[PDB]
Design an enzyme around this catalytic site. Structure first.
Site, PDB file in Angstrom:
ATOM      1  CG  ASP A 185     -43.625 -52.442 -27.773  1.00 47.37           C
ATOM      2  OD1 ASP A 185     -43.867 -51.789 -26.547  1.00 47.37           O
ATOM      3  OD2 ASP A 185     -43.722 -53.603 -28.015  1.00 47.37           O
ATOM      4  CD  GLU A 222     -40.126 -50.092 -24.043  1.00 44.63           C
ATOM      5  OE1 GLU A 222     -40.622 -50.930 -25.122  1.00 44.63           O
ATOM      6  OE2 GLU A 222     -40.742 -50.044 -23.214  1.00 44.63           O
TER       7      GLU A 222
HETATM    8 CL   LIG Z   1     -42.235 -45.706 -23.561  1.00 46.05          CL
END
Ligand SMILES: [Cl-]
Ligand SMILES: [Ca+2]
Lengths: 471, 32
Positions: A185, A222
């Site tokens: 993340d 990400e």
């Molecule tokens: Cl994602």
């Protein structure tokens, strides 16, 4: 780091957004394994903030690394990894390691979250473990983006030996419990130099769960790189894969008529995408399906959405991820819950669709049918490319599968499928059942040629056939 | 300002999305 560690003959990762561990365990055995899926990306399993209204995003505000959330406790988690791994379906953890909380409160396991004083007792973390406050507000400044607070969330200092130790311990704990990798993340908001150290300290995968000796955890990050910023996706591909955001944006445009399908002939790095082996692709994700525009295709625009997903699964580019959503009208709305805040489990209807407010895109015939297609054409390349020089295209994957699309006009052509003679069941409109095709069927001649028919008025704008759905 | 598709939550830090985009949430969303 770039090997998904899928079991043989499997493909695709399904994001079972907000699903509980017990339900995922059931899904692995009753549907994912039988349909040939490779893995599940789960929502954050570590203790996070209990926010007012229980929005979906409370999961992105860690309070500690105790495995106890609305999805279940550690026992349920282990039951899930044991059962899914036995079923040959891998588990990928959504690792939220860039920050803690943006406000004071309590976590899902009762731990205290003191944003104000930067104290998270259950870890523990104190002021010295965070970057000095400042806010992320200038994406042309890599230091601002990485060292400041993202939307008010206390920013961890991964440069610290203590912090690295804590993060490595958390991730290794997950590896001990049988996970195959991690969805990192907000990777763009952390320094690659720190990430390389952390990922290098991760132990090999646990052979007790069916992994080969020396197997390394799959890492996919990400970044959200569309160009014109201080940070580039290329800074993260040395130690893992990157979630290719440009993929869904370009496909969303093409399939909505903003670009002629014939132009997809050179789809790939020429379009500014990452090299295939470094990318994890998707049409939409949990974040961008909540948009103030219509550039991203979602379950709310079925027809082109299924066409884009089909193209993704038919094309050899990258590792594919499929979104599995819960119905929503508002962007902050959390998953189905009862009066007490407990999650309501998806119910499986007789027609294999879900009840209780879950979309279950992965259970759509057009979606799982294409996952089957991808398995059938494994190891082949695009061949027999055809187009009407406008919005009708077709191509085969070796001599194992053929797919045709139309986003303009009726497609009626005698094309070379490259497939052996026989009668094939179109996996989009139906499937092979009881010895016959429940939907459309295509007869391939001795030469591999066949009459392909696909009206622009049909429920779907794609037709797909392969050797494993042959009569 | 925050470029398109990136994390935003104006009520938290007052940082706005770059024109002409707006945040999908007041606390945690994306600029689109
Ligand atoms: Cl994602
Ligand atoms: Ca950071």
């Amino acid at each position: 780091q770039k090997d998904a560690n899928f079991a043989s003959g499997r493909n695709s990762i399904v994001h079972l957004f907000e699903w509980k561990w017990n339900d995922i365990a059931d899904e692995c055995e009753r549907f994912l394994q039988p349909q040939g899926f490779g893995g599940v990306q789960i929502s954050p399993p570590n203790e996070y903030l209990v926010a007012d209204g229980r929005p979906w995003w409370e999961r992105y505000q860690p309070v500690s690394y105790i495995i106890n959330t609305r999805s279940g406790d550690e026992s349920a988690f282990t039951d899930m990894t044991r059962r899914c791994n036995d079923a040959g379906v891998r588990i990928y953890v959504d690792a939220v390691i860039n920050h803690m909380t943006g406000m004071n409160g309590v976590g899902t396991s009762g731990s205290s979250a003191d944003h104000d004083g930067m104290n998270y007792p259950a870890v523990p973390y104190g002021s010295g473990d965070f970057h000095s406050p400042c806010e992320v507000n200038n994406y042309q400044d890599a230091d601002n983006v990485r060292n400041c607070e993202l939307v008010g969330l206390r920013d961890l200092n991964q440069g610290s030996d203590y912090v690295r130790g804590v993060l490595i311990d958390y991730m290794n704990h997950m590896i001990d419990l049988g996970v195959a990798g991690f969805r990192v993340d907000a990777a763009k908001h952390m320094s690659p130099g720190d990430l390389s150290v952390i990922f290098s300290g991760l132990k090999n995968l646990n052979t007790d769960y069916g992994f080969a000796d020396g197997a390394r955890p799959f890492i996919y990050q990400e970044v959200i790189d569309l160009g014109g910023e201080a940070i580039s996706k290329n800074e993260y591909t040395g130690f893992g894969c990157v979630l290719e955001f440009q993929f869904g944006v370009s496909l969303g445009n093409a399939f909505q008529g903003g670009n002629q399908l014939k132009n997809l002939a050179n789809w790939g790095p020429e379009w500014g995408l990452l090299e295939g082996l470094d990318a994890v692709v998707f049409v939409d994700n949990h974040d961008n399906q909540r948009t103030g525009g219509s550039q991203i295709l979602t379950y709310k625009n079925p027809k082109p959405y299924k066409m884009a997903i089909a193209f993704m699964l038919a094309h050899p580019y990258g590792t594919t991820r499929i979104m599995s959503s819960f119905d929503f009208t508002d962007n902050d709305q959390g998953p189905p819950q009862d009066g007490s805040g407990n999650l309501i489990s998806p119910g499986i209807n007789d027609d294999n669709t879900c009840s209780n407010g879950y979309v279950c895109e992965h259970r759509w015939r057009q979606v799982y049918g294409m996952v089957g297609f991808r398995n059938a054409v494994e190891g082949t390349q695009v061949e027999n490319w055809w187009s009407n020089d406008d919005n009708q295209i077709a191509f085969s994957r070796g001599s194992q599968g053929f797919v045709a699309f139309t986003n303009g006009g009726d497609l009626n052509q005698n094309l070379n499928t490259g497939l052996p003679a026989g009668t094939y069941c179109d996996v989009i409109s139906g499937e092979l059942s009881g010895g016959s095709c429940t939907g459309k069927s295509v007869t391939v001649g001795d030469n591999g040629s066949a009459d392909i028919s696909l009206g622009s008025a049909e429920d779907d704008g794609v037709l797909a056939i392969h050797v494993n759905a042959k009569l | 300002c925050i470029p398109k598709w990136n994390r935003c939550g104006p009520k938290m830090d007052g940082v706005p999305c770059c024109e002409p985009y707006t945040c999908t949430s007041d606390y945690y969303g994306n600029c689109s």
